[PDB]
C-alpha cells in the first residue's frame, strides 16, 4: 500500500513551528522487507535466502498466517513455489497457494 | 552568485537558522547607496 | 585635578537618571509579539 | 454479571488482566508480536 514507511516515534513540537512552510515531502522510497511483510519464521528465511538468487524451489509447511485486520492468527498449510525472471535478475516471483 | 547576468530569478531565504523554513524571494543587484562611482558621488560617501 | 568636579557631577548625573529610569520603567519591556502560539518572535526583515 | 455486556468485543485483558496474564503463563493462549511499518499515528511531545 502507499504511504511512506519507517523510522520511529515521531516527535513534533508545536512550540517551534511557524504559520508557514509545508514541511517537505520526504523523497524516501517505500522499501518493505520480506521478513517484515509476513511473519518471521525460520522456514521463510530459508525461502527468501533461496529465493533471492535461487533458480527454482517449492516448500510446503505449517505456518502462522496473520489475518487481514490483525485480530487473529490462523495456522494453515501454504504450498508455495518460486522462479526467477528469466531475463532481468532484479526480481523473482512466488505464487502462494 | 557574484556577477551580473546570473543574479536573477528566485532563491531561498532561510529563516532563523534552520533549513526547514524556506521563503522564496527574488534576487537583484543591490547597489550600496554610498558607492564610489563619480567624484561627486564619492564626496557624498566620504562625507558620512 | 581640575576635571574632578566636572566628572563627579556626571557621576551624579547618571545616578539620578538611573533611579528615575528604574522606577518609571521596571518590567515594562517584557511583552512580546510572538506568533500564534509558538516561541518565535515576529519581525519584518529588518525590524528589531 | 451484566457489567461486561456493555463491553462486548473488547479484549479480555482490559477487563480482568490478572486472569489473562496468568492464562498465557500456563499455555492457552500464546501469542506473537510483529511490527507494521506503515501504520499512521499521532505525534508525541518534545
Ligand atoms: C563640502 C562637502 C559637501 C558634500 C556634498 C557633496 C554631495 C554629493 C552628491 C552626490 C549625490 C548622488 O549620489 O546622486 C544620487 C542620485 C543617483 O541617482 P539614484 O536616484 O538612482 O541614487 C539615489 C540613491 N537612492 C535611490 C537609494 C536614493 O543622483 C541624482 O540624480 C539625485 C540628485 C543629485 C543632486 C546631488 C546632491 C548634491 C548635494 C550638495 C548640495 C548641498 C547643499 C549645501 C549648501 C548649504 C551648506 C553649505
Ligand atoms: C529460462 O527459462 C527457460 C525455460 O523457460 C530455461 O530453459 C531450461 O533449460 C534447462 C537446462 O538449461 C532445461 O533442463 C529445462 O527443461 C529448460 N526449461 C524449459 C521450460 O524447457 C532456462 O534455463 C532459463 N534460463 C536460465 C538462465 O536458467
Ligand atoms: C510466534 O509464535 C510461535 C508459536 O508456535 C512461536 O513458536 C514457538 O516458540 C516457543 C518458544 O519460543 C517454542 O517452545 C515452540 O517450540 C515454538 N514453536 C514453533 C512451531 O516454532 C514463535 O517463537 C513466536 N515468535 C515470536 C517472534 O514471538
Ligand atoms: C495440512 O495438511 C494435512 C494433510 O492434509 C492436514 O492433516 C493438516 O491439518 C493441515 N494443516 C493444518 C494446520 O491444518
Ligand atoms: C511463566 O512462564 C515463565 C517462562 O517459562 C516461567 O519462568 C514462570 O515460572 C511461569 N509462571 C509461573 C507462575 O509458573
Query: Per the CB < 8 Å rule, is A1 touching D36?
Result: no
Could you give the CA distance from residue D14 to residue D18 in angstroms, rounded to a whole number?
10
Please tell me the distance from the alpha carbon of residue C10 to that of residue D30, in angstroms, as a whole number. 87
Q: Note whether B33 contacts A: Cβ–Cβ < 8 A.
A: no
Residues 6+ apart with CB under 8 A from A62: A75, A76, A77
Find out whether A38 and A27 touch, Cβ atoms under 8 Å. no
Ligand 1 pocket: which of B32, B34, B41, B45 to mutate (most atoms within 8 A of CB) = B41
How many CB pairs below 8 Å do chains A and B form together?
A: 10
Residues forming beta bridges with residue A75, ordered by sequence position: A64
Q: For D1-46, give the secondary structure using H, E and C.
A: CCCCCCCCCCCHHHCCHHHHHHHCCCCCCCCCCCCCCCCCCCCCCC
Q: Is C15 on the interface with A (CB under 8 A)?
A: no
Instruction: Name the resolution in angstroms.
Output: 3.6
In this structure, what C-alpha cell is assigned to residue B27?
Answer: 534576487
> Which residues have a Cβ under 8 Å from the Cβ of B15 and sit 6 or more positions away?
A18, B21, B22, B23
In this structure, what C-alpha cell is assigned to residue A89? 535478475
How far is residue A18's CA from residue B15's CA, in Å, rounded to a whole number? Answer: 10
The sign of the CA dihedral B21, B23, B29, B30 is negative
* Residues B7/B28, Cβ–Cβ less than 8 Å: yes
Ligand 5 midpoint to CA D26 (Å): 8
Distance between CA atoms of B47 and A22, rounded to whole angstroms? 48
Instruction: Give the pairing type, strands A73-84 and B22-26.
Output: unpaired
Give the technique used to solve this structure.
cryo-EM
Find all residues with CB under 8 Å of A15, minimum gap 6, and list them: C37, C38, C39, D46
The CA-atom distances, in angstroms, between D7 and each of A65, A85, D11, D21 are 28, 52, 9, 19
- Residue A31 neighbours by CB under 8 Å, 6+ apart: A5
Beta-carbon count within 10 A of B25 CB: 10
Q: Does B5 touch chain A (CB under 8 A)?
A: no
Half-sphere exposure of A24 (CA within 13 A, CB side): 8
Amino acid at each position: 500500500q502507499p504511504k511512506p514507511i519507517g523510522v520511529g516515534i515521531p516527535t513534533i513540537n508545536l512550540r517551534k513551528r511557524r504559520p508557514n512552510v509545508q514541511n517537505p515531502k520526504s523523497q524516501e522510497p517505500v522499501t518493505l522487507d520480506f521478513l517484515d511483510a509476513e511473519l518471521e519464521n525460520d522456514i521463510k528465511v530459508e525461502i527468501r535466502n533461496k529465493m533471492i538468487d535461487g533458480e527454482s524451489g517449492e516448500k510446503t509447511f505449517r505456518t502462522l498466517v496473520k489475518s487481514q485486520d490483525e485480530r487473529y492468527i490462523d495456522k494453515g498449510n501454504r504450498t508455495y513455489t518460486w522462479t526467477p525472471v528469466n531475463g532481468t535478475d532484479y526480481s523473482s516471483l512466488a505464487l502462494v497457494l | 552568485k557574484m556577477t551580473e547576468e546570473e543574479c536573477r530569478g528566485y532563491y531561498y531565504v532561510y529563516k532563523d537558522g534552520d533549513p526547514t523554513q524556506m521563503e522564496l524571494r527574488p534576487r537583484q543587484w543591490i547597489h550600496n547607496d554610498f558607492h564610489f562611482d563619480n567624484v561627486l558621488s564619492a564626496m557624498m560617501s566620504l562625507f558620512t | 585635578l581640575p576635571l574632578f568636579h566636572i566628572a563627579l557631577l556626571v557621576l551624579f548625573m547618571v545616578i539620578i537618571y538611573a533611579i528615575i529610569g528604574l522606577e518609571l520603567f521596571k518590567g515594562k519591556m517584557h511583552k512580546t509579539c510572538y506568533y500564534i502560539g509558538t516561541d518565535i518572535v515576529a519581525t519584518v526583515e529588518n525590524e528589531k | 454479571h451484566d457489567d461486561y455486556t456493555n463491553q462486548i468485543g473488547r479484549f479480555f485483558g482490559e477487563i480482568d488482566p490478572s486472569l489473562m496474564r496468568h492464562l498465557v503463563n500456563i499455555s492457552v493462549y500464546a501469542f506473537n508480536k510483529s511490527y507494521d511499518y506503515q501504520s499512521v499515528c499521532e505525534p508525541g511531545a518534545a
